Amino acid sequence: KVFGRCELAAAMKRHGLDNYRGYSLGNWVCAAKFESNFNTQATNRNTDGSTDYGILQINSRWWCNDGRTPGSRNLCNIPCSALLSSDITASVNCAKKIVSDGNGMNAWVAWRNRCKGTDVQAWIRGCRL
Numbered sequence: 001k002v003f004g005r006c007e008l009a010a011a012m013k014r015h016g017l018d019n020y021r022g023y024s025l026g027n028w029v030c031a032a033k034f035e036s037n038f039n040t041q042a043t044n045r046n047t048d049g050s051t052d053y054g055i056l057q058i059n060s061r062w063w064c065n066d067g068r069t070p071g072s073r074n075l076c077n078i079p080c081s082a083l084l085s086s087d088i089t090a091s092v093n094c095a096k097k098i099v100s101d102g103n104g105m106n107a108w109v110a111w112r113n114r115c116k117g118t119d120v121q122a123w124i125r126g127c128r129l
């Protein structure tokens with residue numbers, strides 16, 4: 001599913017992501033924009049052989065099982081395919097664990113490089129929330 005901007009903001013809010021770990025809703029929407037272009041089915045292979053999955057490009061190296069990332073962990077206790085659903089619940093639940101891991105949203109390098117320090121409220125501007 002390719003979400004609209006405001007549509008994804010609403011879905012993230014209902015799942016409790018807004019201000020989660022102190023990160024306002026626009027941070028999460030900005031991260032999703034640059035990670036996946038709001039597409040739940042996004043996948044991207046990393047040069048180490050892990051893969052990033054879903055709207056927030058969660059990495060199989062640590063967070064989900066895809067069966068082909070040797071040595072990796074599955075800290076969200078889910079198949080990586082669950083992160084590709086139209087329903088964002090699994091991605092949100094796992095993102096909550098990632099952002100709680102010590103480095104905040106810097107775990108998403110695209111957030112650090114493209115969202116951190118910017119006017120992230122622009123990503124929810126105009127949305128009926």
Ligand SMILES: NC(=[NH2+])NCCC[C@H](N)C(=O)O
Nearest residue numbers: 061062073075101103106107
């Ligand atoms: N509990 C964990 N294993 N977290 C991930 C550890 C490494 C982390 N992805 C890093 O490069 O900054």
Ligand SMILES: NC(=[NH2+])NCCC[C@H](N)C(=O)O
Nearest residue numbers: 035052057107108109110111
């Ligand atoms: N650390 C991340 N945010 N990884 C997800 C993708 C971001 C990175 N610029 C890439 O596409 O390779």
Ligand SMILES: NC(=[NH2+])NCCC[C@H](N)C(=O)O
Nearest residue numbers: 005118119122123124125126
């Ligand atoms: N229609 C929107 N509000 N899009 C997101 C805002 C974009 C933001 N101003 C930026 O600098 O990229």
Ligand SMILES: [Cl-]
Nearest residue numbers: 018019024025
């Ligand atoms: Cl917020």
Ligand SMILES: [Cl-]
Nearest residue numbers: 024025026121
């Ligand atoms: Cl915001």
Ligand SMILES: [Cl-]
Nearest residue numbers: 033034035037
């Ligand atoms: Cl881009």
Ligand SMILES: [Cl-]
Nearest residue numbers: 067068069070
């Ligand atoms: Cl594996």
Ligand SMILES: [Cl-]
Nearest residue numbers: 011086087088
């Ligand atoms: Cl949803």
Ligand SMILES: [Cl-]
Nearest residue numbers: 087088089090
């Ligand atoms: Cl889900």
Ligand SMILES: [Cl-]
Nearest residue numbers: 021103104105
């Ligand atoms: Cl933080």
Ligand SMILES: [Cl-]
Nearest residue numbers: 115116117118
């Ligand atoms: Cl920040």
Ligand code: NA
Nearest residue numbers: 060064072073
């Ligand atoms: Na894994």
